[PDB]
């Protein structure tokens, strides 16, 4: 169990083991969402200044 646990620990501290890859496709969504909101803000603001 030492072999297995430290193999997973130093195979994970790079970023490849399952647990850290189940929280990374759950936070990239949050960042993508915030960025989409920023873009929509600017889109509405500029098309307001235009008119």
């Amino acid at each position: 169990q030492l072999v297995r646990l430290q193999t997973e620990l130093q195979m994970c501290l790079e970023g490849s083991h399952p647990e850290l890859q189940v929280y990374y496709s759950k936070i990239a969504a949050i960042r993508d969402y915030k960025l989409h909101r920023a873009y929509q803000r600017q889109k509405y603001e500029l098309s307001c200044i235009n008119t």
Binding site: Q1, L5, L9, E19, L20, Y23, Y24, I27
Partner: protein, 32 residues
């Protein structure tokens, strides 16, 4: 994400240290 990952890893290394003290008591148990 940095804080969250390394926080959970601090917990899992307190797990590994749990097993450290485990084999401490089994260290004296093999010294027996």
């Amino acid at each position: 994400i940095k804080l969250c990952k390394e926080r959970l890893y601090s917990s899992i290394e307190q797990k590994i240290k749990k097993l450290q003290e485990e084999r401490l008591l089994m260290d004296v148990a093999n010294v027996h």
